[model samples]
Target chain A: NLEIGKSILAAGVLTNYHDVGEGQPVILIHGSGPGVSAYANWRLTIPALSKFYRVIAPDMVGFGFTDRPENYNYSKDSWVDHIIGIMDALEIEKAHIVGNAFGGGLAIATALRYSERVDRMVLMGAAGTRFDVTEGLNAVWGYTPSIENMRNLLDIFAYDRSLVTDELARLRYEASIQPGFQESFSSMFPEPRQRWIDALASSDEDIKTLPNETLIIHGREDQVVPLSSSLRLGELIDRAQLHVFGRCGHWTQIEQTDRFNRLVVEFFNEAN
Target chain B: NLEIGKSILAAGVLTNYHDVGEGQPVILIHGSGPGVSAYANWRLTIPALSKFYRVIAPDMVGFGFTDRPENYNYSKDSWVDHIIGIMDALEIEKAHIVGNAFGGGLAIATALRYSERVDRMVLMGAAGTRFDVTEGLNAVWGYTPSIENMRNLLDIFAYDRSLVTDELARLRYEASIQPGFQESFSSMFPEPRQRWIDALASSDEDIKTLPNETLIIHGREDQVVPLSSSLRLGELIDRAQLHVFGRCGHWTQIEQTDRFNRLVVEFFNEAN
Candidate 1:
């Protein structure tokens, strides 16, 4: 049985997400990459987080098992709306939010658009601030279907080479060729990708005024998303604190799973 | 007798500096504050760093025990020239540089202007990158003569409240009112302080092209100079490694002295 995760109907599209435990809601959003799903991005994180809070990991439109609506447009507006729809469907009023890379930007958009619905926020190797597009991100966005290509991308995502196994590459490569995966991924960020970065970024003025108590985390050696973005976010958010782990890369959730999970749980547990 | 430090003629001004140890040279640049001197800023750092390298800590043209030339126009160019002049005067062709806050910008300028004269660089709570002027920095630059005012500035600089003793504040207050001190300090950065931040900043393009191995250190809770600046520096420089300490502030060397000393020595010892 493939780990296609769970199914739900939200934002006028049949969305796929993971719901676990029972407590105050904590939503997890996955990064944008070929073959990336909510489960694939947060497999290690969900179990650890679910122990302390109700965890929700959603597959936003255009990726994973979520139903891609006909003639659908992809933008921060649509993505934020989808996130809110999921929360409303699940009867969640306000919840803690955790985002990884591209999903990090979506989390920022959600907080900026619907400040009341977010109690606390955690951004891991986030990219919701302006930066020159990095080559590692370019390689990720320009990925094609091949075991070798997937393995190469994995190497770029992870600073630890031992994590790149043949079996993992094959599985990710197989996921890349799934129906509608490549087509949607290619359309999301085409050549001249700087615009996509600018599109995801919240205005500095808006970021400076964020009311949520935020936790900014980054891998010291992150390649895909420059750590500078999180640094700028930390400076902009008044009530924010930053944690950077050394010898780590863009895969903070995976590379430093224990610390990442513990930090997020501790942050959410703090009194409002 | 006042620990005015050793004096030398550099950049056409009488520069006050501290020279110690015996090995590959390491130049220490002190921050710009109401009463800072090379001895005050790097007193703890020099002893630790000098154990392995010949440490040279200097009071720049303004805001220290150094002779502040009459009508000395303070700018990055003049500061950088003074650094080169020190290296020339000491017969140090190239050396590792350690800069604290304002001195951090001078280190960046030196590396940019005289790339050949620099080996490795360490920027601690540095202010050579662009960002909005923080209230903490504004308070530091706008300080007037008073023990209470000095104590308040100390509270802003150190996250550990216990470190800000009354005697320390009184001593610093005394240092602020030294001959020619307040006169030069007041003239360096006046009201509307964003321009000073911009002026100290190296062009993004130039930062991207820096050839030396750079070590970026920042206190996670630094109120004066935002940690985001170091994050930007880490991102811009290709050969940079960043280390951020938790529960720390702008005084990284003073607050995390042991770890900071070990890290810098280890970084320089690494094969080029």
Candidate 2:
């Protein structure tokens, strides 16, 4: 059994992740939503992808079972550092990265800052391309996890609503309704948005300049990230391919699991 | 020997097309440019999809080896009508369409006008999403093809400089330098970006109402057609998926041939 585990990074944050299989290493980053966790986003994905590769889905700093430090500023650098820190702990010299929503931006920043650590990446429903938050993101951060709220958010996350099972809502809500969850989540990033607008992964010409072979995935019905978010990112990145799945939403890993897995594996295995 | 064959449409116009394979029919529509033709654009794509389906790539009403009539007024309706006429001659009740650039807009217009004939469509770098023209487009319609200038313009359509083959420039230059080519080009759309804004295939409301499944593909770095042209179509269409190829330009069917063919085929094969 590949049990749930935690790795204490030297940076004083605990990263909870699922380590599975053994082949080419690929780190999967989960998104930011109520009760957002690696397991929540990558439950079926971890074992399925493990068949061909070493897949590590990490609960990022301040998320899931990972340690949440109140004093640590929740800036882009902090999250990017956490990703690299996980890589360091695993002795992964270079590996493919896959991320969704909040983690999506982390993948981009890591690729830019430590291109050596990243060989290629797939970003799903990525946010933070622009610093200014939307009604959808504001909804994510401000979520008070009730059965109703969780159901509504999950409903919007997928074009096919049948995926939002009863257990899924209960599980996510149980994890999210915790002490100080709000403060820690809010404290991570700048409040006014303009303060760190320039720091976004999509803010500058560097995104255009970076040469990362990437697959930028989005759901046409993704109300949270917005289809335009990945569309513009698709235009900005020089070596990124954008695939927008219709009848799918922000929950790409959950919604389009089979197709997403097949394509991502093909992308990683194929040469440039 | 020139292998591409021609057929006489009901409109008494000679239609040039490359037809191959059997089974489900897919009509390939070439873009509107100086010397754009079905063979040059769909060379790799035809064989790939033809293995599993019948592929018919046509030189639209005005361009390529197709007959050009003097005093002919070029508009979206004529091209859309000609597409229906070609389908009638082929005896195909319903077929998938894969369109590039100007043809992308044609695909949408066909779906809107002749919904019964179009099964599904993949629109590449489609224009007419909004009424405004782009500089990249302005350059195409504004072109006077010298050998040097033709090569330079084709250069903007793809990321790899080597793809702007010498033979390509020669063929296009020869076709473009012919009489009525310049006048025919300007007659189709507003040249400076506003002259024919009202002639768009469908508006926000119109595209929203179309029922066919769509795959909107674009080169993320497309200078000629621009990514937003297809991006906005993605926004307006309910059942459409938008795909952006990175490091690629306007010529997606040519630039990202293998993956583009695969994605487009998969999209068409899937049950809506």
Model 2: pairs clashing at backbone N, Cα or C within 3 Å? A74-A188
For candidate 2, give the lDDT: 0.77
lDDT of 2 by residue, B38-143 (tens): 8867878888889888899877777766778777667778878888888898898999988887777788889888888988888888774664676767777778
Name the regions of candidate 1 deviating beyond 4 angstroms: B1-146, B155-272
Q: Candidates' lDDT values, in order?
A: 0.86, 0.77
Model 2: chain A TM-score against the true structure: 0.90
Q: What TM-score would you give candidate 2 relative to the actual structure?
A: 0.86
What's the C-alpha lDDT at position B204 in model 2? 80
Give a tens-digit lDDT track for model 1, residues B99-190.
Answer: 99888898989999999999899988995569999999999999899999999999999989899999999999999998878877887899
**Per-candidate iRMSD:** 5.0, 1.4
lDDT of 2 at A182: 54
Alpha carbon lDDT at A47, candidate 2: 73
Docking class of 1: incorrect
lDDT by residue (tens digit), candidate 2, A180-253:
65556655443554444346455657677667788989987877777777767776777788888878878887
